[PDB]
Amino acid sequence: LTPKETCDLCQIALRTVFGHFGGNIPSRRKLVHQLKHECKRHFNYRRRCLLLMKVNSDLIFREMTDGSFKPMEVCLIMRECNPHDSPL
């Protein structure tokens, strides 16, 4: 994966799962079951995605449930996006 792809993928994944719950996220355990499912939709990204959500599910949960949600921002904090890259 390019650093671009890797950034884009972070965003696509978090946005898709956030849209899935329509912003009403029930619990971290549940959030995680979907983050994992969503990781497996991407052949080349599965392995990295899965470890990313594992380590950072608390940060993703917090940011998602605050109402802010901007995917590109949480991906910057995880350093899967750098200030260089762009949103979607």
Residue numbers in the entry: 1 to 88
Please give me the paper's original passages concerning this structure.
In this study, we investigate the structure and biochemical functions of two SAPLIPs from human (Necator americanus) and dog hookworm (Ancylostoma caninum), Na-SLP-1 and Ac-SLP-1. The structure of both hookworm SAPLIPs were determined in hexagonal space groups, and closely resemble the fold of the Sap domain, as known from saposins and other SAPLIPs. The fold is comprised of a four- or five-helix bundle, where a kink in the third helix can lead to occurrence of two helices, α3 and α4. Three conserved dithioether bonds link helix α1 with the C-terminal end, helices α1 and α5, and helices α2 and α3.
In the crystal structure of Na-SLP-1, the C-terminal extension of about 30 amino acids, which is attached to the N-terminal Sap domain could not be resolved, which agrees with the results from mass spectrometry. The crystal structure contained two molecules in the asymmetric unit, giving rise to a complex network of molecules in the crystal packing with a variety of different protein-protein contacts. The two monomers in the asymmetric unit agree very well in their overall fold as is reflected by the Cα rms deviation of 0.55 Å. The crystal structure of Na-SLP-1 reveals the presence of seven exposed basic residues on helices α2 and α3, giving rise to an extensive basic patch even on one monomer which is likely to initiate contact with the membrane surface, driven by electrostatic interactions. Crystal packing analysis of Na-SLP-1 reveals a P2-symmetric dimer, albeit with a moderate interface area (571 Å2). Despite being a monomeric protein in solution, this dimer may possess a functional importance in the membrane-bound state, since it combines the basic surface clusters of the two monomers into one large patch. For Na-SLP-1, we found 14 void volumes with values larger than 5 Å3, the largest ones being 29 Å3, 30 Å3 and 43 Å3, using the same probe radius as in the granulysin study.
